[PDB]
Amino acid sequence: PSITNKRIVGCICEEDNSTVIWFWLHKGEAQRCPSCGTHYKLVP
Amino acid sequence: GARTWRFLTFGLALPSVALCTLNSWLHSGHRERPAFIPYHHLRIRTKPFSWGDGNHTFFHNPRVNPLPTGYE
Amino acid sequence: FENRVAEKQKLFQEDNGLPVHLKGGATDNILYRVTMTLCLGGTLYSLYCLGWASFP
Amino acid sequence: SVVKSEDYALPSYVDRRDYPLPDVAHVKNLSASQKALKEKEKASWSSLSIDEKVELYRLKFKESFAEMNRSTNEWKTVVGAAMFFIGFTALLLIWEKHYVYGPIPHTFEEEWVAKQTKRMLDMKVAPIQGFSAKWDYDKNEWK
Amino acid sequence: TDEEFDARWVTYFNKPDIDAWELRKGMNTLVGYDLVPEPKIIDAALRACRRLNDFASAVRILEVVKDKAGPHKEIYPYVIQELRPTLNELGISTPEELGLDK
Amino acid sequence: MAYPMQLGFQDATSPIMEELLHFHDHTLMIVFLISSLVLYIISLMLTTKLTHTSTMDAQEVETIWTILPAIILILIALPSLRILYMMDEINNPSLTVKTMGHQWYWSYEYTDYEDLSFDSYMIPTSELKPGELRLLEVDNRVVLPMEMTIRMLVSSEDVLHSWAVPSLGLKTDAIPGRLNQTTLMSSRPGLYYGQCSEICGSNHSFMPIVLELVPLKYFEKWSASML
Amino acid sequence: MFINRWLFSTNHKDIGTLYLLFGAWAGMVGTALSLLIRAELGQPGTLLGDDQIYNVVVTAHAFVMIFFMVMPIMIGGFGNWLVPLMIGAPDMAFPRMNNMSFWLLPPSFLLLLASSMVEAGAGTGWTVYPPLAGNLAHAGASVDLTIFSLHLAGVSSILGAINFITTIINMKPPAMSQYQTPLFVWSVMITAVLLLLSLPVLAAGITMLLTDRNLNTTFFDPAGGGDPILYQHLFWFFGHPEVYILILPGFGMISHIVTYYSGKKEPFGYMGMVWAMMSIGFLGFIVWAHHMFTVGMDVDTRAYFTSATMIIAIPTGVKVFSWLATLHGGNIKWSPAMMWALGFIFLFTVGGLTGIVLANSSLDIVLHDTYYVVAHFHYVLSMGAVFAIMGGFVHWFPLFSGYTLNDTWAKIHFAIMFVGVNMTFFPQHFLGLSGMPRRYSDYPDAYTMWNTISSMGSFISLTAVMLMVFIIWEAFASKREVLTVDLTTTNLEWLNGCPPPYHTFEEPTYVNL
Amino acid sequence: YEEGPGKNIPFSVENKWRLLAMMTLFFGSGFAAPFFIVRHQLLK
Amino acid sequence: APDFHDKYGNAVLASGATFCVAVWVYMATQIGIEWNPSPVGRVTPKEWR
Amino acid sequence: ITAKPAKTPTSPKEQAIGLSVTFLSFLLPAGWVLYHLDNY
Amino acid sequence: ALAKPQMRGLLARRLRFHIVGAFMVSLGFATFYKFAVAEKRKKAYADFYRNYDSMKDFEEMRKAGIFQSA
Ligand code: HEA
Ligand code: HEA
Ligand SMILES: CCCCC/C=C/C/C=C/C/C=C/C/C=C\CCCC(=O)O[C@H](COC(=O)CCCCCCCCCCCCCCCCC)COP(=O)(O)OCCN
Ligand SMILES: CCCCCC/C=C\CCCCCCCCCC(=O)O[C@H](COC(=O)CCCCCCCCCCCCCCC)COP(=O)(O)OC[C@@H](O)CO
Ligand SMILES: CCCCCCCCCCO[C@@H]1O[C@H](CO)[C@@H](O[C@H]2O[C@H](CO)[C@@H](O)[C@H](O)[C@H]2O)[C@H](O)[C@H]1O
Ligand SMILES: CCCCCCCCCCO[C@@H]1O[C@H](CO)[C@@H](O[C@H]2O[C@H](CO)[C@@H](O)[C@H](O)[C@H]2O)[C@H](O)[C@H]1O
Ligand SMILES: CCCCCCCCCCO[C@@H]1O[C@H](CO)[C@@H](O[C@H]2O[C@H](CO)[C@@H](O)[C@H](O)[C@H]2O)[C@H](O)[C@H]1O
Ligand SMILES: C[C@H](CCC(=O)O)[C@H]1CC[C@H]2[C@@H]3[C@H](O)C[C@@H]4C[C@H](O)CC[C@]4(C)[C@H]3C[C@H](O)[C@]12C
Ligand SMILES: C[C@H](CCC(=O)O)[C@H]1CC[C@H]2[C@@H]3[C@H](O)C[C@@H]4C[C@H](O)CC[C@]4(C)[C@H]3C[C@H](O)[C@]12C
Ligand code: CUA
Ligand SMILES: [Cu+2]
Ligand SMILES: [Mg+2]
Ligand code: NA
Ligand SMILES: [Zn+2]
Incomplete structure (x- = not known):
């Protein structure tokens, strides 16, 4: 969910990873975590 | 959480035990036993003990525990 | 006494752009001006007192 | 390809040897001839000229590995400038000696030092290694 | 094991409908490892570039093989040797043939 | 030194x-x-x-x-x-000596037998005799017997000082109301120097320590001559 | 608008900026004091006056460098700027109390400069030991002004510690555990716990000194049954934790800089790094009497303090080796910030090792109150804390400002400062072993060569400080605006652009479980 | 409030020469103060 | 195209080095600084009493 | 990092002025005090 | 045709070779330091005191005029 057309996602790719992977998710086609490939879709 | 208490167990508690084990295993050599003095407030015998010859304490150590009459 | 919290909620949520320290009205401005005048004036007096105490 | 401040939240282009395939093309907008070149790229690459292959590389990427990894003469500027400013420091120390420092104590006079040196040898200052140890008391000279 | 690692990576790049994102993810992940990829892995990545109509990424893959070899100057010319049949078949010019080593 | x-x-x-x-x-x-x-x-x-x-x-x-x-x-x-x-x-020391720190000089007390005490001040730079060391010489040295275990007791009558002789491995703080003990044994005759080792005001840099280590017989005669 | 923004701030970034400005000004004062020290010692004889004016300069040097330069820059500046951004928080827990932590410091600094202007100053050392700091040997206002300076700096840091602990515990994304926060955030939380526990004990001790000076108490006066050594215990119960407070945020910045310029997504051995910082913080409370090995404590006490102090080398070593293991296999970028961090790893290690020499009470008899101690602590402070500050400053300046530095100038700056600090402090080891005391305005003639070289070093460091001011001017003068920053996926503080908007994370991050 | 480069600071960077003057006074006053304090203590 | 370092690097390195050595040698030897070196192998001891 | 070219470039001459003014702001006041120490 | 070179674990191989190199050097420096500093100091003190005559040392000092007490 977002009240705008982009939001920062933090992806904890595997349980108990200390490293969080951060990226902007934009309105439109699903994007993938650049570390694990997990799909995220914005719902403004 | 379990993760925090495991972190304390291995990161603080067992290291403490290891350090106290090292401390102890460095001061573990036998102390020089003191001259026997037949003090009336020590080696009390009001009734024989219910084991052995009645005159030896339960965890009697010949090296450091004298009898009423002195070291064995 | 009576519960007048609703009337104070209306006053402090009024859409007037005032910061919370001035939003009670004219008395807040007065108490703000007294406080800041004593602080700034007292600070100038503390500086004068250092000037004085810096010489025998 | 003009990169704008207001684009910080969008996927961006990088030349990094550890990130060889970046998130976007170097050049996104294509001229008529560049559009024809991308169509030609869908056919056999054997039919592309060397110039066409270089143009396809330069649309996708800004610098080659050889370009992004190149060495520079920057070390000359850094070492030389550091030595200049260290030299400038010696000017401050010359100024300080001339205009700030007065005479040093009379105990540094050559004759004082000669007498203090003998007195240190007479009291056998550091006779095992440090000082008197280096004096030959038999021959009356330094070892 | 080495053979199992190499087989996983060949399979990854050989997926017929591999997309551009997967091609990049693969190469950007692969270059993090303490190795220069075996020619069979590079061959499969270059054929993925062909299915994706991406000539430039094929050249870039050859550059990153050279880069991962570091001071070991014998590795890159060995890998190019092993890839020559694939380079000829797909019309892939090396970075050297394109002057991109200057 | x-x-x-x-x-x-x-x-x-x-x-x-x-x-x-x-x-x-x-x-x-x-x-x-x-x-x-x-x-x-x-x-x-x-x-x-x-x-x-x-x-x-x-x-x-x-x-x-x-x-x-x-x-x-x-x-x-x-x-x-x-x-x-x-x-x-x-x-088992043979001798006890006390030192009291002061702004800015050391006093010494040798009271095992007689009441021997004196003050020990830096020789000013303008009054050094040829060969003498700037900031290190004193008027009245701490004469002591060589090759003997000596108990040194250290205190102060004003602020903190610290009694140090680096070549003997010695540094004992001088604290008013406290009597700190150290032991001193010199393997050799000679002159052994130290300097006050706790910030004590205007002349902290200028209240040094000079030990003069000599045979017992010389120490006894010096002691008698200092009463 | 200007007053509302800069005097009435409730914004973590602007308050961070106020702290960095305050710290930079303080660093110039501390540098000037350091040059007066080395001018006095740069040739045998007396330059300024006797030990009183000299020790006023030494005392002020230490208080300015520690309380007005390092703590405000590391905690107030980097901590306020980076901690909220690194956890996706919209500000600090107590954004108005945050502003009071900042505004207490100008008055604290004013009281210290007043101490030096009235009477003959506070020539006490930064430890302020009685009876020299008492109302007989330091009659008049100077020491009281120093005590009040410390009281205001203490309240500033206690309220700041409450703010950081609360923010770091309470304001992370709900999916983020403490074991998913960056090392810099851990380094600030641990430093804040040390401040919370240590500063109140200092406050109690200097309050007792105040009452001995003004209300006829005798806490430290043997005439009333007091003990000067009690002051030392209370001071050092604070003072050892204080040095871990000065280095911990530097350890956190070094972890980030080494990771970033190695091209890594993460530091080597994250949980080991957290373990090491918590271990150092804990051990730092049980070692204080290694500052008191010559006061006359019992042999078993000296044995305990020797042993407990040496234990700190184990967690500290894990951090040094973990930094080396972060470099291992990196795509190394030889940025100015990387040069600061690499100098840190080496020079901090040397100063840590001379600390381990000093931990040995038997050897400390001969090294205590000598320049060997001065060499130890300037390796860890003037080449450790300062190198971490300079590394963090050149790394994050473009985040804070939106402008780039000239990297060539920044490398020149590093090279000059590296030569100057080593030329200043390396020879002080020789002065310490050979017996030169601390807090001396003049030295026996034998010590002239190393004091001469040390003073020349200090002038090279001055040239570096002057160049740094020019480098910051050149960045603001030229206005090169940041475009892209690498590795934003593992450096959240950069992901809102350069500089970030006044309000960030108005909409919080999405992190699922 | 103004946002962006040169606007998130309590000093102006609109003119690099006015900025040099302000930075000179700022860092210069910090560096000068101890020399003038020593002068003050010597002149009593 | 050639940058600052390509154009000026050689001159900055040569001039900086020459200047630094010259001014430090002058400071060390020509303005009366007392280094107080070891008397060992240097000073002839002289009667003091 | 990448960045735009300077919006207000600082020429070598301008840099020599800034560096000179910066150094003088540190050196002249301290210099004046240290030169006059004997007078004090 | 070129031979297949080693392509895997090159960084690990370099690390293993050089860490062993550093260990071997550490042992060489410790042996050197034992010899040039530690043992030299023990032998300098042992040789100084072996036939040391403290009374003769004192007599030389006394005759040089160094003492207040003699
Ligand atoms: C940032 C500041 C800082 C830091 C971090 C430290 C860290 C340490 N300090 Fe220091 N210290 C000071 C600042 C600091 N110190 C100051 C200011 C004083 C003087 C106070 C005054 O009187 O004014 C001082 C004084 C001081 C004393 C008192 C000496 C005296 O007055 O006589 C001692 C005594 O033990 C001490 C020891 C240590 C030790 C053991 C560490 C340890 O934390 C160091 C640990 C680090 C390492 C050991 C290096 C890395 C480790 C490895 C590579 C692993 C392998 C190592 C081994 C096997 C040994 N220091
Ligand atoms: C952080 C602590 C710190 C720092 C950095 C320093 C730095 C320096 N110190 Fe000092 N010093 C102490 C803490 C520090 N000192 C303490 C605690 C004492 C003991 C006091 C006592 O005995 O009571 C002491 C004592 C001390 C003495 C011993 C005095 C004596 O015993 O008589 C000497 C002698 O040379 C000395 C010199 C110097 C020199 C030449 C520097 C130079 O290296 C300084 C060079 C300049 C810098 C390192 C720049 C600083 C500025 C910044 C980093 C600003 C950055 C700006 C931005 C980020 C925008 N200091
Ligand atoms: C190793 C860890 C601890 C081990 C615990 C003990 C082991 C054996 C017995 C277990 C029962 C312990 C309970 C406490 C009772 C009394 C004594 C036990 C303490 C002990 O073990 O003490 C020993 C003596 O035991 C003696 O007398 C002999 C004791 C044996 C007979 C005891 C009989 C008394 C029982 C009393 C029961 C009362 C129960 C109360 C219930 C209350 C409900 C309302 C000490 O050895 P020692 O040689 O004197 O000195 C050492 C010299 N080297
Ligand atoms: C010799 C004389 C020297 C004395 C120096 C005196 C120093 C300063 C003068 C003090 C002026 C105090 C004015 C009141 C301050 C109140 C702070 C407060 O109450 O802070 C709160 C947070 O601290 C909290 O809770 C919990 C913490 C509350 C702390 C209250 C203030 C403490 C002041 C002194 C503390 C010293 C510590 C004593 C132990 C050594 C609120 O945080 P804000 O950011 O405001 O708001 C957040 C909003 O969401 C609220 O709606
Ligand atoms: C709103 C901004 C803040 C307002 C600032 C107000 C400042 C004016 C204060 C008046 O100054 C006073 O002067 C008295 C002298 O007339 C002093 O008396 C004291 O000092 C005298 C000196 O003669 C002595 O009689 C005694 O110590 C004592 O009466 C006293 O110290 C001092 O305060
Ligand atoms: C007493 C302490 C003194 C410290 C001395 C500081 C020395 C200053 C070094 C500046 O010189 C440059 O450094 C670059 C790095 O900063 C080099 O980058 C080159 O070399 C690197 C490989 O080592 C690569 O990462 C780069 O891609 C490449 O361009 C570049 O060629 C070189 O001229
Ligand atoms: C630790 C930081 C300091 C490092 C060293 C500072 C370097 C010196 C910078 C120059 O400072 C100036 O030096 C002049 C002398 O060279 C002084 O003029 C003085 O001397 C002149 C020549 O005799 C006279 O003409 C002037 O009237 C007289 O004020 C002048 O006042 C002073 O500002
Ligand atoms: C258990 C805990 C956290 C593990 C996790 O949940 O990820 C880890 C983190 C750091 C670890 C410690 C550090 O690696 C330092 C020590 C390393 C030794 O090999 C074992 C003990 C040692 C003291 C470790 C014990 C334990 O494995 C710790 C404390
Ligand atoms: C009458 C009034 C009602 C309050 C209300 O409900 O508004 C009562 C409720 C509880 C009362 C208070 C409590 O009973 C406790 C106090 C009792 C004392 O006898 C008078 C004062 C005292 C402090 C009371 C004042 C006042 O009468 C209160 C406040
Ligand atoms: Cu007495 Cu220092
Ligand atoms: Cu400590
Ligand atoms: Mg002391
Ligand atoms: Na001097
Ligand atoms: Zn993921």
């Missing part, structure tokens, strides 16, 4: 100072080795174009990283604590 361009400790005048020199050599070898190993490893990490940027497993290597340092610290601690307890051992 120190000499120009000196790198290390003043030569040892007492057996304990000899012990501290050998302990310092052992410790400094370890410091040199660890310093060197870290610099070398930095330089190794920074001199290759080869890369490995994926997640690396820590636990095996952390065993080495903890056990080896623990062993090295034990190898320092063992001789460190042997020397600590050796200085603390019972020795």
